[PDB]
């Protein structure tokens, strides 16, 4: 994973999972922040 | 814990510890009207006391 | 043995002296255990004294156990008045049209009052669905001190927090119509807001003043758009043109079902509640109606009726209420002010889901005119078609809708983003779909 | 030519009606009668809400009242018996002024938008408590409220006062009215370190509160009690604990002083009003008018801003909600199981009467609060590296 | 606009990125019931105003 901004994240795939805990503060980072707000949803899955 | 007891030797306080019921630390949630309930988890315990 | 209930209904207005009398009440669904006994009365123009006097007058010894109210009027206040009588009588009252249907302050729990207008919360939800459909993400709210504020602000807050999209709430404004202004204090605030999409909430009369002031401020023009709840549009029969054109608002449809059909719904609800309450306790709901004296004994027992009456179903149709007394999900129509004085329908919305007709560049611009539909094809990375989450029911984040004739597909990618920035800069709206024959152009 | 401008009111007794008319005539005599004259109309309280509302639409509004005054009836029925008028006048935006309604539910402009009063609500009593809290330096307290618009409003007001400071919710405790046993909630209260308590409830509820509180011996020293006027009064007084601190609004019982003053203010407001043009008379009679009265909100605006600081009741100015400002209360103490004035509160500053301070249990002087907690309850989560 | 023009040259020539926020032209003639001057003036958010 090249960076915090990873094209691989930016290029999400159903085939390549990226996983987190719902209600983890990271999720709060995803919801509160507008700039990456699109990217949150892919993480939300699984 | 070692930090806490380090403080406890440093600080006048005495400590009793219990883990929060919810596995989550805390997050805002629940009902719509006004602002309702409070963030679930240990943080919620802190405000609740 | 024979359990005949006592009921009364009133119509105000109707644009007739000799308003259509007793059109309904004709036996339908007679199977229901209690048969209705109906007394119908009409009164021409509304008053607190006239209505209070008449409703108590019909109460007399008559002992009516239910009332339905209906009006030609645009008046907000009426519902509350009848509600007050209900609080006093503990006699159920509901209304099928106009002002009674128009929203009101949160009803006293002990009190029994119902409205066939939509819930404030529901309406706010529909307003949000409308904004999401056109993907207008950034918006502000102008409100007034009229009841339901903060139930509305809260409802918007709840509805907004949950969604993934990076929408922006810019400002919320609370201005008292009371302490009416020399200051044009409303002008002084309203002038501040820069946001493109505005939700307004107030009494029918207040909307006029706020709009004249907005016309002075320059808020009605050119790219800004306004969205409104049931109250302002009211009947929709009469429309001061002080309201700007392109004004967007939701209301109940007259065309789908006429007022007598609606009254039939009300009667059906009252007698169904009576039948269910009967089935439970085998007990007559009938009670002494007279307001002047103390409320009749065992009327205090009536609470359970409300408990029974909240959800009622007949004709394969649900009347289910909400704790506030608005019906849970009446069918609703998305309406716009067509050029000139027309209120012309744009959308239909029901239960969970909403459907709207126009594709693109919705809604006579001085700088420029018409609308542009666009076609594309899927290629990676540049134009990517994705299947939208079925649970969500509509596209998420950067994804913009595109349709393919063969089903809604969600397009996002390089072309989508470049197009999006371009649309933002040149300021026009557009409809996007997918090509069928031959993808990128081919010569045979 | 003279013009007769009517006023209307609902009052407890015919004697008070005569007092009303007398005050009105004093207003006429002392202000230009050539330009304008004031006329008085009034009616006794009716048994139900409905007879009275009908009275307003028929007996009063037919006289074209520019404003209405209202007072609590001789035997209070439920509460907020002057609820209907605020609604009824409100339709036409006719300003209403209550004399005796200290009820808080009228403070929200939304539901009652025509309502003004010559007395502050029970919620505004918190102004005292903050000042009280301010003097004694207890930042830590506990709040016990009944669950209703009244209690919740009190909580909102006090918390809003605290918001200027770092927000202080030391603890807050909500109970629902009509509940005879409150013991568990107080058991929860003792655990909280802060030893000072403040409560708002109805008399009947307060009986239960003190009854439950005495069982757990929270009435003892090291604990402080602050309360509303209603709490010290009635059956609640009988079961009340010693050393409690209490409040009584001045001239709260008297309608008449408030009558003379309210009418004086109305007169000043009108005479100030007619200085303005594009005025319209209020609707003649309830019948046939579905429309509001455009002047009414303006009349409200001037009337809220209407000064005239010299009055029989005290200083007069009105807050945003139309509630009165700078009212005066008399602090009360329970010494020897009897009510005594330890001090009196007027304006924004408390005043200390010569009488000795009493605290609950035996104290010559004992301002004690907050104790200290010798224990820390600690919480954690299951995270592998640090736990 | 000669004022505007002079400012445009003076402000423009300099390397610095100062910002002109609004320029407002209102006729004192056709005196206002509308408070059109209030309606324009209320809008501007800038800290420093040349009149
Ligand atoms: C809600 C209305 C007052 N509201 C309550 C009383 C009702 C008249 C009535 C008379 C007799 C019996 C029952 C009811 C008329 C409507 C007012 O507060 C308001 C209006 C608009 C606004 O921005 C802020 C406040
Ligand atoms: C309190 C009450 O009557 N609730 C009713 C329940 O009795 C009924 O069985 C159900 C059917 O949908 O609807 C709801
Ligand atoms: C009559 C009576 O004491 N009723 C109950 C009691 O049984 C109980 O201890 C308490 C809550 O624990 O609620 C109270
Ligand atoms: C300030 C004021 O007027 N207070 C009045 C007083 O004049 C009157 O004698 C008595 C009741 O009639 O108490 C009250
Ligand atoms: C003055 O009040 C009396 C009631 O005492 C009433 O009869 C009369 O009509 C009133 N005058 C006006 C002009 O309203």
Residue C142, SS3 per DSSP: strand
Q: Which residues of D touch C149 (CB under 8 A)?
A: 110
User: In D217-359, which ranges are E strands?
Assistant: 224-227, 245-249, 317-318, 324-325, 329-333, 343-346, 349-352
Resolution (A): 3.8
| Contact partners, residue D217, CB within 8 Å, separation at least 6 | none
- One domain for residues D207 and D336: yes
Residue C36, SS3 per DSSP: strand
What is D1-20 written as a DSSP string?
---EEEEEEEES-HHHHHHH
Give the CATH number of the domain where residue D159 resides. Answer: 3.40.50.2300
- One domain for residues D350 and D222: yes
User: Chain C: residue nearest A14 by CA?
Assistant: C386
- One domain for residues C218 and C356: yes
- One domain for residues D217 and D273: no
For residues C266 and C312, what is the distance between their CA atoms, to the nearest angstrom?
Answer: 10
Query: Ramachandran region of residue E13, left (φ > 0), alpha (ψ -120 to 50) or beta?
Result: alpha
- One domain for residues C194 and C155: yes
Give the CATH number of the domain where residue C354 resides. Answer: 3.40.50.2300
Decide if E39 and C187 are in contact by the 8 Å CB cutoff.
yes
8 A C-beta contact, residue D127 and residue D341: no
What is C287-347 written as a DSSP string?
----SSSPPPTTSGGGHHHHHHHSS-EETTEE--B-TTSBBS---EEEEEE-STT-EEEEE
- One domain for residues C15 and C89: yes
Longest alpha-carbon distance in chain A: 27
- One domain for residues D113 and D3: yes
For residues D52 and A25, what is the distance between their CA atoms, to the nearest angstrom?
Answer: 59
8 A C-beta contact, residue D122 and residue D103: yes
- One domain for residues C280 and C309: yes
- One domain for residues D237 and D281: no
- One domain for residues C90 and C152: no
- One domain for residues C244 and C272: no
- One domain for residues C318 and C259: yes
- One domain for residues D57 and D106: yes
Can you read off the two tokens belonging to residue D341? 């004035």
Flag whether C440 is marked binding.
no
- One domain for residues D229 and D133: yes
Can you read off the two tokens belonging to residue D84? 């209907």
Q: Which residue segment(s) compose the domain that C286 sits in? A: 1-118+253-330
- One domain for residues C44 and C128: no
Partner residue opposite C164 with nearest CB, options A11, A35, A41:
A41
- One domain for residues D248 and D335: yes
- One domain for residues D277 and D243: no
- Pairing verdict, β D37-44 and D4-11: parallel
Alpha-carbon distances of C92 from C41, C73, C88, C305, C325, rounded to whole Å: 17, 21, 11, 9, 11
- One domain for residues D266 and D291: yes
Rounded to the nearest 5°, which phi and psi values hold at C228? -135, 150
Decide if C179 and D297 are in contact by the 8 Å CB cutoff.
yes
Name D38's bridge partners.
D5
- One domain for residues C335 and C324: no
- One domain for residues D209 and D258: no
Q: Which residues of C touch A12 (CB under 8 A)?
A: none
- Pairing verdict, β D68-70 and C168-175: unpaired
Q: Subunits with at least 3 CB pairs below 8 A relative to chain A?
A: B, C
Burial of residue C215 (CB within 10 Å: 0-12, 13-18, 19+) is: middle
| Nearest ligand 5 atom, CA D39 | 1
Residue C140, SS3 per DSSP: strand
| Nearest CA among C236, C400, C424, C421 for reference residue C333 | C236
Q: Which residues of B touch A23 (CB under 8 A)?
A: 24, 27, 40-41
User: Which ligand number lies closest to the CA of residue D188?
Assistant: 3
- One domain for residues C34 and C93: yes
Decide if D288 and C45 are in contact by the 8 Å CB cutoff.
yes
- One domain for residues C229 and C326: no
- One domain for residues C5 and C21: yes
Alpha-carbon distances of C90 from C84, C288, C296, rounded to whole Å: 10, 11, 9
Q: Which residue segment(s) compose the domain that D138 sits in? A: 121-253+327-368
Pocket test for ligand 3, best of D179, D180, D181 (most atoms within 8 A of CB): D181
Q: What is the distance of C-alpha C425 from the center of its chain?
A: 34
* Number of DSSP helices (H) and strands (E) in chain D, helices first: 11, 16
- One domain for residues D131 and D224: yes
What is D298-312 written as a DSSP string?
HHHHHHHT------S
Please tell me chain A's helix, strand, coil percentages from 3-state DSSP, rounded to the nearest 5. 45, 0, 55
Rounded to the nearest 5°, which phi and psi values hold at C319? -100, 10
């Amino acid at each position: 994973i090249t960076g915090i901004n990873d094209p691989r994240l930016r290029n999400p795939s159903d085939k390549f999972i990226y996983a987190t805990v719902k209600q983890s503060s990271v999720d709060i980072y995803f919801r509160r922040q507008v700039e990456l707000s699109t990217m949150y949803r892919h993480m939300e899955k699984h | 814990v070692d930090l806490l007891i380090k403080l406890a030797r440093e600080m006048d306080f005495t400590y009793e510890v219990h883990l929060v019921a919810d596995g989550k630390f805390g997050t805002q949630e629940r009902v719509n009207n006004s602002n309702a309930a409070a963030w679930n988890g240990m943080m919620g315990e802190l405000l609740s006391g | 043995k024979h359990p005949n209930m006592d009921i009364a209904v009133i119509l105000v207005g109707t644009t007739e002296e000799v308003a259509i009398k007793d059109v309904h009440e004709k036996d339908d669904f007679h199977h229901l255990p209690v048969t209705p006994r109906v007394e119908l009365v009409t009164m021409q123009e509304s008053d607190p004294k006239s209505i209070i006097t008449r409703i108590c007058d019909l109460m007399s010894d008559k002992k009516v156990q239910g009332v339905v109210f209906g009006d030609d009027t645009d008046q907000e206040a009426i519902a509350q008045i009848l509600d007050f009588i209900s609080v006093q009588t503990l006699t159920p009252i509901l209304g099928i049209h106009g002002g009674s249907s128009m929203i009101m302050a949160d009803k006293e729990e002990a009190s029994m009052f119902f409205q066939f207008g939509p819930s404030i919360e529901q309406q706010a939800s529909v307003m949000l669905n409308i904004m999401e459909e056109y993907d207008w993400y950034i918006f502000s709210i102008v409100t007034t001190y009229f009841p339901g504020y903060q139930d509305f602000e809260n409802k918007v807050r709840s509805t907004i927090e949950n969604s993934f999209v990076g929408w922006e709430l810019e400002e919320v404004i609370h201005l008292d119509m009371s302490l009416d202004d020399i200051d044009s204090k409303i002008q002084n605030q309203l002038c501040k807001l820069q946001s493109p999409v505005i939700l307004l909430y107030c009494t029918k009369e207040e909307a006029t003043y706020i709009f004249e002031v907005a016309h002075s401020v320059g808020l009605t023009g050119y790219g800004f758009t306004w969205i409104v709840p049931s109250l302002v549009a009211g009947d929709t029969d009469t429309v001061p043109d002080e309201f700007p054109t392109g004004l967007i608002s939701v209301s109940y449809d007259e065309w789908d079902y006429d007022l007598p059909a609606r009254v039939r719904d009300g009667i059906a609800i009252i007698t169904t509640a009576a039948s269910t309450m009967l089935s439970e306790h085998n007990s007559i709901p009938q009670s002494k109606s007279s307001c002047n004296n103390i409320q009749e004994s065992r009327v205090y027992e009536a609470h359970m009726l409300k408990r029974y009456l909240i959800n009622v179903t007949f004709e394969g149709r649900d009347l289910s209420f909400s704790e506030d007394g608005y019906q849970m999900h009446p069918k609703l129509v998305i309406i716009l002010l067509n050029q000139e004085r027309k209120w012309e329908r744009v959308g239909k919305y029901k239960d969970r889901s909403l459907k709207m007709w126009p594709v693109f560049d919705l809604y006579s611009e001085e700088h420029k005119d018409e609308h542009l539909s666009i076609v594309t094809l899927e290629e990676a990375p540049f134009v990517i078609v994705e299947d939208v989450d079925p649970l969500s029911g509509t596209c998420m984040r950067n994804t913009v809708p595109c349709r393919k004739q063969i089903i809604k597909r969600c397009c996002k990618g390089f072309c989508i983003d470049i197009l999006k920035k371009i649309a933002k800069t040149v300021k026009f709206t557009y409809d996007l779909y997918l090509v069928t024959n031959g993808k990128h152009g081919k010569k045979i | 030519d003279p013009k007769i401008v009517n006023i209307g009111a609902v009052l407890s007794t015919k004697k008070h009606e005569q007092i009303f008319r007398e005050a009105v005539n004093q207003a006429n005599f002392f202000h230009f009668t050539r330009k304008i004259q004031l006329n008085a109309t009034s009616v006794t309280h009716r048994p139900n809400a409905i007879q009275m509302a009908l009275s307003v639409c028929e007996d009063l509004i037919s006289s074209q009242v520019y404003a209405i005054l209202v007072s609590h009836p001789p035997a209070p029925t439920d509460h907020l018996t002057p609820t209907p008028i605020s609604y009824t006048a409100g339709f036409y935006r006719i300003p209403v002024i209550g004399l005796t309604t200290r009820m808080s539910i009228y403070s929200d402009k939304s539901i009652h938008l025509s309502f003004l009063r010559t007395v502050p609500p029970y919620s505004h009593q918190a102004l005292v408590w903050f000042e009280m809290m301010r003097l004694f330096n207890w930042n830590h307290v506990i709040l016990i409220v009944s669950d209703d618009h009244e209690g919740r409003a009190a909580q909102k007001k006090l918390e809003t006062l605290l918001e200027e400071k770092e927000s202080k919710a030391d603890k807050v405790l909500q109970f629902e009215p009509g509940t005879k046993n409150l013991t568990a909630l107080l058991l929860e209260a003792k655990e909280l370190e802060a030893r000072v308590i403040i409560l708002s409830a109805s008399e009947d509820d307060a009986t239960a509160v003190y009854k439950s509180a005495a069982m757990l011996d929270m009435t003892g020293a090291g604990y402080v009690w602050l309360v509303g006027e209603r709490e010290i009064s009635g059956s609640a007084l009988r079961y009340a604990p010693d050393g409690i601190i209490g409040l009584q609004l001045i001239n709260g019982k008297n309608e008449s002083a408030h009558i003379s003053d309210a009418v004086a203010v109305v007169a000043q407001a009108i005479h100030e009003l007619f200085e303005m043009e594009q005025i319209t008379d209020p609707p003649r009679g309830c019948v046939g008018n579905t429309n509001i009265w455009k002047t009414g909100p303006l009349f409200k605006r001037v009337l809220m801003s209407s000064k005239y600081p010299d009055g029989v009741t005290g200083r007069i100015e009105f807050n945003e909600d139309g509630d009165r400002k700078f009212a005066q209360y008399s602090i009360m103490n329970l010494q020897n199981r009897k009510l005594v004035q330890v001090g009196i509160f007027d304006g924004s500053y408390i005043i200390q009467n010569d009488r000795k301070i009493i605290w609950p249990g035996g104290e010559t002087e004992r301002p004690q609060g907050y104790q200290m907690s010798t224990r820390l309850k600690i919480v954690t989560i299951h995270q592998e590296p640090f736990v």
